[PDB]
Every structure is written in C-alpha cells, then in structure tokens.
Design a protein around this ligand. Structure first.
Ligand SMILES: CN1CCC[C@H]1CCn1cc(C2=C(c3c[nH]c4ccccc34)C(=O)NC2=O)c2ccccc21
Length: 320
C-alpha cells in the first residue's frame, strides 16, 4: 500500500540530515551549449566525458549569490533536491563547488517544456491535459508527504521527457514546513489567495496551483490574467472564473473545488485530502498506478567558465 511513502520519508529524512557533497568535478565534463541564463542560475548542456551521457549543469557565481541575498534559497534548493526521489522529479545527478562557483548537474530533459508547447499548439484536449495533471497530483502527494511545499508550479517548469512524461524542475521556492508559512513568492497567476492576503498558508496552495495549471492546460490560458501583476492579484482575491464554451461539465466543477477561495472547502486539504482529487468524475478514466509505472501511452512525444585562483565565500557555502 502506502508503505511506499513511509519507506520514502525515511530515505529522504536520512539524506536531509546528511546531504551528499562533492560528487564530481568540472574537468570531467565538456561544454556543448548554453541552454539559458537568468533568475534560476546559468544553465549549460554538458557531456560526461568518462560515460557519454548528457546533463543540464546549473552554474551559480557564489559572489553573486551573496550580493543578491540568495544564500539560503540556494542552499535549500540543493539540500531538498539531493534528498528527493520520484519518477516525475528531475534528478540532481551531481553537485560540487570550486573557487568561484556552485554546480548542480541535472537530468537533461530535452523534449522542451510545457509553457512552450501550450504556446505553439494552442491548447490541450481534456484527455491530454488529464495525463499531465495525474503526474502532478502524484508528485504533490509525495512532496506533501515529506512536508515539502512546491510553490513554483507553472507550465515553464514542467519539462516533457522522451517518453512523453513530465519532469518537474526548479525547487527554488520549495520549503520544508510541517505547519504554516508566510513568504510571498511564486508566479502571480499561480498564487493562491491566502498567499496574497498575507495570512500564513500551508500545503493547500499547491492544489489551487494545480487548478490554475489544469485550467491553463485545458483552456490555452490561465484563469486570472492581466497586463499588470496587482491586476492578477485583484482577480484571484475576487475569485470569479469564466470557463470557455468547450469546457466539459465534470471539469468545470473540478476547477471550482481546487480554485476554492475558502481553505476548508478545498480539495487536497480535507478529511480525505488527496483522494478527492483521484475519486472525482474528471479522473474516471485515469488509472492512478499505470501513470506511476509509466505504462500509459502518452498523448504526444516530441562563454568561458572563469574560475578564480582564490576561493570565494568559503564559509557561507561550506554546507553545499
Ligand atoms: C529558464 N526556463 C526556460 C526553459 C525552462 C525554464 C527553467 C526551468 N528549469 C529547467 C531546468 C532543467 C533543464 C533545462 C532544459 N533546457 C533549459 C533551458 C534553460 C534552463 C534550463 C533548462 C534540464 O534539462 N534539466 C533541468 O532540470 C532547470 C534547472 C534548475 C532550475 C530551473 C530549471
């Protein structure tokens, strides 16, 4: 049964108290190309020279992490990532550091990412949409089981691997909390209301987020949108949603129960909790273990690194 979860709460708690450090070195890798550069670090497709494989290497300038006051978000991302295992979570393969930089070597997810697929296709049929939502629910079941709130769900973070399945990436806003917490963070279209009204909030913000994701997937656009962020903030608070013509009925009611402004009458956060997600008419034709196992047919399958001679920021990244 869910002896699987307590077996994984153990595996994660052990890696959490004694995280792995220094499991590779930059010399044993080779620059192919710069995938991207930005908020989440500067990432590089690289090849492991003694094995053949490819990986996404995120490189962070330590001095710049300190300047931008991102020390603890960075240590925390790494610490969570090296402790978690689930088939829809991208894997921190290796991590290490050197004089100038930190390095997180990740599974390379080469099939592009969901934001970009919505953009170019237009929208997903409801079955296709439902294939992804399943993986996210099973992912949020796991993460929530180890007391990890995700807080960055959005299409841009959801890569599509070579068997059509989803890998969640970016743990930058992830937090380990048993109780409640308060940081205003995350993509505005995806924020649940209690985050904006600056009360505390809990695990439940990830299910609101799921609903925003389900909507955006199914519809082609997110349910609360504007040219300005406070205008997105304003709509979420007012809780008024217009489903487009072609939405099915059973779905249109799923999105009323995940996008519920009222904490206690909201799916995910209940007596039952997660099973209200699974035991529901829109997920009737969804085998919840064939998804885990990867047996379902997926609906669609597509600079110099200057390193200083002197060590920088030694004490502030000693845990890394
Ligand atoms: C910057 N955005 C454009 C593409 C996706 C998005 C960033 C989301 N994202 C994708 C990451 C990963 C990968 C990326 C694949 N193509 C990219 C292009 C830019 C940035 C990252 C990636 C990857 O292969 N494995 C990953 O884990 C990643 C690693 C750490 C933090 C955020 C990340």
């Amino acid at each position: 049964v869910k002896e699987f979860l307590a077996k994984a709460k153990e595996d994660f708690l052990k890696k959490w108290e004694n995280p792995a450090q220094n499991t590779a070195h930059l010399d044993q890798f080779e620059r192919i190309k710069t995938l991207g550069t930005g908020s989440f670090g500067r990432v590089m497709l690289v090849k492991h020279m003694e094995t053949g494989n490819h990986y996404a290497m995120k490189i962070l300038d330590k001095q710049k992490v300190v300047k931008l006051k991102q020390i603890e978000h960075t240590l925390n991302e790494k610490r969570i990532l090296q402790a978690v295992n689930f088939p829809f979570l991208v894997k921190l393969e290796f991590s290490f550091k050197d004089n100038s930089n930190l390095y997180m070597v990740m599974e390379y997810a080469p099939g592009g990412e969901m934001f970009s697929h919505l953009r170019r296709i237009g929208r997903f049929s409801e079955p296709h949409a439902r294939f992804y939502a399943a993986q996210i629910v099973l992912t949020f079941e796991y993460l929530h089981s180890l007391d990890l709130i995700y807080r960055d769900l959005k299409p841009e973070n959801l890569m599509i691997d070579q068997q059509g399945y989803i890998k969640v990436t970016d743990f930058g806003f992830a937090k380990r909390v048993k109780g409640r917490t308060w940081t205003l963070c995350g993509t505005p279209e995806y924020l649940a209301p209690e985050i904006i009204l600056s009360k505390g909030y809990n695990k439940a913000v990830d299910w609101w987020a799921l609903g925003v994701l389900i909507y955006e997937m199914a519809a082609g656009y997110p349910p609360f949108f504007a040219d300005q962020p406070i205008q997105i903030y304003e709509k979420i608070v007012s809780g008024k949603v217009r489903f487009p013509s072609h939405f099915s009925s059973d779905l249109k009611d799923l999105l009323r129960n995940l996008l519920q402004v009222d904490l206690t009458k909201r799916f995910g956060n209940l007596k039952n909790g997660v099973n209200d997600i699974k035991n529901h008419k829109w997920f009737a034709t969804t085998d919840w273990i064939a998804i885990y196992q990867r047996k379902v047919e997926a609906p669609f399958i597509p600079e110099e690194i200057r390193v200083s001679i002197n060590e920088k920021c030694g004490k502030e990244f000693s845990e890394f």
